[PDB]
Amino acid sequence: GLDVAISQNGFFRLVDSNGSVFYSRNGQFKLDENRNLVNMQGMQLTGYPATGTPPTIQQGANPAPITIPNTLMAAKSTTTASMQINLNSTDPVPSKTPFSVSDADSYNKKGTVTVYDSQGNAHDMNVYFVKTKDNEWAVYTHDSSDPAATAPTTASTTLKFNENGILESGGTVNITTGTINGATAATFSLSFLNSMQQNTGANNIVATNQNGYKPGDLVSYQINNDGTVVGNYSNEQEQVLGQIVLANFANNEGLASQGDNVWAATQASGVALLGTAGSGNFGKLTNGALEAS
């Protein structure tokens, strides 16, 4: 239940299911099963549609019932990931060889980042750091979520730090996951940007990130003060969904009262002249609204 009623001039422009056009300052809307914003009589709020990719609102558009679709979005295979680590320059070179994901004294640090394939399966990617000599650290990776994956015997990259402990080379490497339940692997660039070798400390992962996700439910929608309607999604992205139109008449005294505070245009009032809040004839909405799904 949204509330964007108008203490100002301007009317919202509504249509009934037959396309007849009505006007009201009442701003109480519910999102119905048809994915329209409707008043208590079931009339549909109208505005300019969004078109293109990315979707945008054009100046040339016919007002139409606002929709807030409601259709899902696909999954998203990971193509980037990052891990920022602080490594201890005083760490020992492990004496236990060879490196093995199962021998905890064969490496200096282990971290994890969960990535996704196109089907949305999670792959828990384990990342192991093995100090090889002064200022150099071999990095092994392994998809812990794939039982058929070969154990890592060769490093995916080697981090080299300069005398000041700043990352000098080896900080970017393409990784391919294993496969899960017959689905194709993810292939992503793994970045160690902003990783450093401290003069003294304990090996510690400060941050990880990646850009994939599972077909997953999302979050909120809002009406901005220019009447643009935007959806907010759980992938940290947004989509414009429409833009509410306002109407003005040459003679408001001529409008036919329909009861409640709803009105119809007449010969006496003149035709509705349309625009948007915050432009031309119309000032901004007093605030807008924000609603969780």
Could you outline the blueprint of secondary structure elements for this entry?
Layout: E1 2-3, E2 11-15, E3 21-24, E4 28-31, E5 37-38, E6 44-48, E7 64-65, E8 80-88, E9 109-116, E10 122-133, E11 136-143, E12 157-161, E13 167-169, E14 172-176, E15 187-191, E16 196-198, E17 204-210, E18 220-223, E19 228-232, E20 238-244, E21 246-248, E22 256-257, E23 262-264, E24 273-275, E25 289-292
Parallel strand pairs: 8-15, 8-16
Antiparallel strand pairs: 1-4, 2-3, 2-6, 2-21, 3-23, 4-5, 6-7, 6-20, 8-17, 9-10, 10-11, 11-12, 12-13, 14-15, 18-19, 18-25, 19-20, 21-24, 22-23
Please give a structural write-up.
The protein is an all-beta fold. The protein has two domains: 1-74 and 215-293, no CATH class; 75-214, Sandwich (Tick-borne Encephalitis virus Glycoprotein, domain 1), CATH 2.60.98.20. It contains no helices and 25 strands. Strands 2, 3, 6, 7, 18, 19, 20, 21, 22, 23, 24 and 25 form a twelve-stranded antiparallel β-sheet that branches. Strands 8, 14, 15, 16 and 17 form a five-stranded mixed β-sheet that branches. It has a five-stranded antiparallel β-sheet with strand order 9-10-11-12-13, with no helix packed on it. A hairpin with a 2-residue loop joins β10 (122-133) and β11 (136-143).
